[PDB]
Amino acid sequence: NAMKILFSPIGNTDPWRNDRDGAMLHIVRHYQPDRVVLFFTESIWQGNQHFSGQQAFDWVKIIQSINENCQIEIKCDTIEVENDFDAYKDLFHQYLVEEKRKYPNAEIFLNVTSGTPQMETTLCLEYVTYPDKMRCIQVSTPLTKYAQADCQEVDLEIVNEEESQQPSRCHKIAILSFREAIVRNQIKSLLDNYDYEAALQLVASQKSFRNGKEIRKKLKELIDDIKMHRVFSYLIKQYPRNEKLQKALLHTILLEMRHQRGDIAETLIRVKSIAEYIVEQYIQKNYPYLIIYKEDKPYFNVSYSQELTESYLALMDSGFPAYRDFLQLLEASNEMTNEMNKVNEINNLRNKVAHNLDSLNLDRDKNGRKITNAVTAVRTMLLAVFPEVQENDFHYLKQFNQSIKELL
Amino acid sequence: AMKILFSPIGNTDPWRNDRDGAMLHIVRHYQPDRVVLFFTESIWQGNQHFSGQQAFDWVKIIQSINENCQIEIKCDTIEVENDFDAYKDLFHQYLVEEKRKYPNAEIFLNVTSGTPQMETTLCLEYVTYPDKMRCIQVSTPLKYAQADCQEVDLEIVNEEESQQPSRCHKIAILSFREAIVRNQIKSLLDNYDYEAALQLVASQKSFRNGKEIRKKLKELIDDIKMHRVFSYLIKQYPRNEKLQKALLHTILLEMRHQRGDIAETLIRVKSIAEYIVEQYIQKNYPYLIIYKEDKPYFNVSYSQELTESYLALMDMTVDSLDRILGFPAYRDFLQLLEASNEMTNEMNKVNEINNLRNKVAHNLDSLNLDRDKNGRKITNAVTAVRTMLLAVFPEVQENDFHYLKQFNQSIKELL
Numbered sequence: 105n106a107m108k109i110l111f112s113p114i115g116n117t118d119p120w121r122n123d124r125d126g127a128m129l130h131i132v133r134h135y136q137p138d139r140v141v142l143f144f145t146e147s148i149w150q151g152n153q154h155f156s157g158q159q160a161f162d163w164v165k166i167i168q169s170i171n172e173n174c175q176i177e178i179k180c181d182t183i184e185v186e187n188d189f190d191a192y193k194d195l196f197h198q199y200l201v202e203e204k205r206k207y208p209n210a211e212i213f214l215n216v217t218s219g220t221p222q223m224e225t226t227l228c229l230e231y232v233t234y235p236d237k238m239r240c241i242q243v244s245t246p247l248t249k250y251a252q253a254d255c256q257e258v259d260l261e262i263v264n265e266e267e268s269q270q271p272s273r274c275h276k277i278a279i280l281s282f283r284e285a286i287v288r289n290q291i292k293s294l295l296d297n298y299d300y301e302a303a304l305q306l307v308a309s310q311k312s313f314r315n316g317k318e319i320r321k322k323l324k325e326l327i328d329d330i331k332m333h334r335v336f337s338y339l340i341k342q343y344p345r346n347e348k349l350q351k352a353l354l355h356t357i358l359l360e361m362r363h364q365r366g367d368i369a370e371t372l373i374r375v376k377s378i379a380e381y382i383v384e385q386y387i388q389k390n391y392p393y394l395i396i397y398k399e400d401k402p403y404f405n406v407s408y409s410q411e412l413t414e415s416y417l418a419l420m421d422s423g424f425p426a427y428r429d430f431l432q433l434l435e436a437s438n439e440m441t442n443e444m445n446k447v448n449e450i451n452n453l454r455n456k457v458a459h460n461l462d463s464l465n466l467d468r469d470k471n472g473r474k475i476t477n478a479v480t481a482v483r484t485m486l487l488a489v490f491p492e493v494q495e496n497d498f499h500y501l502k503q504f505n506q507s508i509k510e511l512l
Numbered sequence: 513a514m515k516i517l518f519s520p521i522g523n524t525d526p527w528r529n530d531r532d533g534a535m536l537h538i539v540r541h542y543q544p545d546r547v548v549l550f551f552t553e554s555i556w557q558g559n560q561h562f563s564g565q566q567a568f569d570w571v572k573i574i575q576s577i578n579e580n581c582q583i584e585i586k587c588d589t590i591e592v593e594n595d596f597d598a599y600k601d602l603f604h605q606y607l608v609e610e611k612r613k614y615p616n617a618e619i620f621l622n623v624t625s626g627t628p629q630m631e632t633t634l635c636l637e638y639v640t641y642p643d644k645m646r647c648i649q650v651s652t653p654l655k656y657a658q659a660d661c662q663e664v665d666l667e668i669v670n671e672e673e674s675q676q677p678s679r680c681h682k683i684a685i686l687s688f689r690e691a692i693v694r695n696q697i698k699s700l701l702d703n704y705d706y707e708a709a710l711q712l713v714a715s716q717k718s719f720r721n722g723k724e725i726r727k728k729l730k731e732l733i734d735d736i737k738m739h740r741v742f743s744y745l746i747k748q749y750p751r752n753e754k755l756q757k758a759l760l761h762t763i764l765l766e767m768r769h770q771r772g773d774i775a776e777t778l779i780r781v782k783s784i785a786e787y788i789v790e791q792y793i794q795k796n797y798p799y800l801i802i803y804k805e806d807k808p809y810f811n812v813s814y815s816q817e818l819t820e821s822y823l824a825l826m827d828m829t830v831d832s833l834d835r836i837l838g839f840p841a842y843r844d845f846l847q848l849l850e851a852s853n854e855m856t857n858e859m860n861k862v863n864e865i866n867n868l869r870n871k872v873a874h875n876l877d878s879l880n881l882d883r884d885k886n887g888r889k890i891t892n893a894v895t896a897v898r899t900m901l902l903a904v905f906p907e908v909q910e911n912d913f914h915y916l917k918q919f920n921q922s923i924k925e926l927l
């Protein structure tokens with residue numbers, strides 16, 4: 105229930121040879137197309153010493169004889185060099201573009217047996233390049249009688265009767281595996297750069313992929329995970345009882361992704377908020393009721409340790425900056441202190457790009473290195489706050505990439 | 513550079529009608545260092561109209577016109593010699609092998625010899641793995657070859673080809689691969705996947721304008737990554753560096769929002785808004801804001817008529833409020849200085865996503881567009897930014913909001 109158009113070169117074994125259909129007629133016979141576009145070289149239509157010339161055969165009559173209500177279209181071109189790819193690259197491209205234009209829902213069947221061998225290769229290369237609603241059909245030679253214009257009508261019905269008890273010699277060839285490889289090698293490099301939307305895009309387009317449904321599912325889940333800051337289901341299963349761990353872990357993974365990919369300005373802006381979330385929970389865990397919230401926003405309480413309250417005042421007269429102040433007073437030059445310093449080294453640099461909208465310059469005053477130390481600090485802190493986190497889960501993205509490649 | 517010839521064999525080989533066949537002709541005019549001949553077992557065995565290709569001395573024939581040539585003969589059993597299946601994996605194995613042991617060698621493929629499927633397979637391979645490969649065609653020059661008269665037939669063939677042209681042509685079919693990559697790239701630009709588009713353009717050396725496409729794609733990539741103002745904006749709006757940066761971020765903001773990235777959109781809209789109003793308060797109420805230490809602090813003496821009003825707003829005196837100005841303060845000052853004019857409604861839309869911003873930005877919560885119509889408020893907060901930007905900077909031209917749309921069409925046209 106669709107329009108079937110056949111594009112068919114024409115060769116010396118057409119319309120038939122040895123009382124057996126020629127490649128063009130055999131596709132017509134076994135596929136019954138609604139439209140047929142024939143392409144004759146000027147030289148094979150006129151003729152040479154060894155061949156009468158294809159203008160002698162009534163092409164519309166022969167095709168409609170075995171295919172009812174078949175629309176036929178003859179194309180004839182002058183080709184100075186008939187084995188030259190250049191003569192067919194653009195000529196065949198322009199014809200098929202016209203058929204696709206006129207009949208967008210039609211199925212296009214290409215004869216890759218008729219004409220010169222380079223006609224086969226050009227149609228096979230067009231197909232590989234534009235596979236949609238297109239397919240290549242090959243007709244095999246039967247495993248000496250020549251087509252005669254003078255004896256057309258008799259020969260046709262002889263060929264009919266001999267073909268009535270013979271099996272089909274048409275075979276839909278399988279060469280889209282070549283296009284698949286081009287796309288496969290392209291997707292591998294996209295995955296390494298965390299270009300998952302682009303990976304999905306190339307995968308979606310390639311209907312050939314044997315594991316397409318699984319690939320598309322895993323990619324979309326991850327893509328939406330990234331966009332809405334959703335914890336990865338794997339992280340949900342690994343750490344089911346600690347949602348606070350899950351979220352700090354998702355962000356540290358995404359933070360390292362952005363930094364690795366070159367989204368450095370992006371990285372710098374988000375380092376602090378993740379650093380704040382991990383320090384916030386560090387304070388709850390080891391000095392619990394120091395923090396008090398009435399509208400879900402950290403507020404410093406003095407009743408936890410009144411004496412310590414006054415020591416902050418001593419320091420002040422002389423949020424992350426507050427946690428950093430609190431902590432150093434309770435414990436100085438310890439594991440946690442020297443990590444939050446490195447996050448504070450970019451505090452004022454973060455303000456420039458976050459709130460003054462300025463550009464980022466790694467070249468100036470050792471700037472990029474300052475960002476790398478801050479990222480490293482976030483990982484080092486996360487492990488101190490949540491000792492249950494496994495170092496091997498930091499490679500979730502690299503592990504996800506590899507699992508996808510093996511599916512490609 | 514080492515030159516490797518992978519040539520199938522056909523019936524016209526080694527020679528026909530006193531002129532070379534496809535293989536020997538490429539051999540003559542290219543002098544490869546290594547030749548790999550591929551034979552179907554059927555053509556090797558024969559016994560149909562001839563004794564088979566085994567009767568010829570391929571090593572002796574090929575080295576007769578190529579002094580230093582190491583020749584590998586591969587023979588395989590092919591049940592159906594017109595079936596792509598038997599060649600597309602087989603030939604792939606052979607070419608992969610040659611490249612592994614000879615990584616810097618040029619691969620010359622004979623596309624003329626054998627059945628058409630051998631021609632088409634090798635062309636499909638080259639289109640797929642073009643690096644260091646090329647396809648050579650031998651045209652017919654316009655009495656078959658027997659093995660009993662080898663050494664005389666070779667000499668005859670040699671003397672007659674001495675005075676004949678090259679007859680070998682390097683095919684140009686890499687346009688097909690270029691058309692595959694071209695349409696891959698068009699979609700990538702549509703989604704703003706510039707790094708992926710650069711990858712795909714860089715992989716395709718054939719691209720006529722790849723050098724221009726690459727330098728333009730890297731500039732934009734770096735400007736987005738490092739938040740560098742578009743040079744076009746620098747030239748189109750000089751002497752207002754504040755406008756330049758507010759405009760860049762409004763484009764990056766809208767870019768993010770249009771392609772998803774809704775959680776990253778949510779966090780940034782507030783910071784770009786606070787920037788726009790800050791320059792709106794400077795421009796309209798000079799010295800209302802004082803930058804006491806590289807941050808917007810409030811001027812308690814700018815105007816005492818509404819300095820009491822701000823105090824009155826805070827449910828005790830002015831000694832306490834030396835806190836850096838943020839978005840709430842700006843909004844507070846503007847509802848006392850004006851009465852719900854075009855600007856306070858726009859700021860309200862940004863305020864409409866404030867609770868959601870903290871939730872996502874600072875508590876690290878996930879984003880849901882379906883729930884509580886959060887996607888609809890977010891969209892309103894982005895429009896508000898672009899609307900404020902136009903009020904604070906009337907100078908800005910509306911058509912510059914399509915900068916990315918235009919950049920993609922420029923890259924597309926060059927493809």
Ligand SMILES: Nc1ncnc2c1ncn2[C@@H]1O[C@@H]2COP(=O)(O)O[C@H]3[C@@H](F)[C@H](n4cnc5c(N)ncnc54)O[C@@H]3COP(=O)(O)O[C@H]3[C@@H](F)[C@H](n4cnc5c(N)ncnc54)O[C@@H]3COP(=O)(O)O[C@H]3[C@@H](F)[C@H](n4cnc5c(N)ncnc54)O[C@@H]3COP(=O)(O)O[C@H]3[C@@H](F)[C@H](n4cnc5c(N)ncnc54)O[C@@H]3COP(=O)(O)O[C@H]3[C@@H](F)[C@H](n4cnc5c(N)ncnc54)O[C@@H]3COP(=O)(O)O[C@H]2[C@H]1F
Nearest residue numbers: 115116117145148186219220245522523593594626627652
């Ligand atoms: N019923 C029936 N019957 C029959 N048949 C049939 C049927 N149905 C179906 N079918 C199918 O179809 C097809 C046929 O074809 P046709 O159509 O006929 O076509 C032809 C023609 F016609 C065309 N043309 C030409 N011209 C023209 C024009 N104008 N227009 C249009 N068209 C045309 O083409 C074709 C061919 O012919 P030729 O002659 O060759 O031609 C050539 C040239 F001449 C041309 N031209 C033109 N013009 C020009 C100019 N100006 N210039 C230049 N040129 C030119 O072109 C062409 C080309 O081609 P190529 O290939 O590329 O080339 C060639 C030549 F030329 C070259 N060279 C160089 N040098 C030289 C010298 N010195 N001398 C000479 N020559 C030369 O080289 C080449 C050659 O080749 P070879 O090597 O020979 O190869 C062959 C053979 F041998 C192979 N084989 C076979 N077997 C084997 C084995 N085992 N192994 C290995 N190998 C082999 O192949 C080939 C072919 O042959 P054949 O016979 O055909 O074969 C077939 C079959 F039989 C097979 N097989 C086997 N087994 C089997 C089985 N089991 N199954 C199945 N099958 C088989 O395979 C094949 C197939 O093929 P196809 O095509 O696809 O198909 C056919 C049939 F079958």
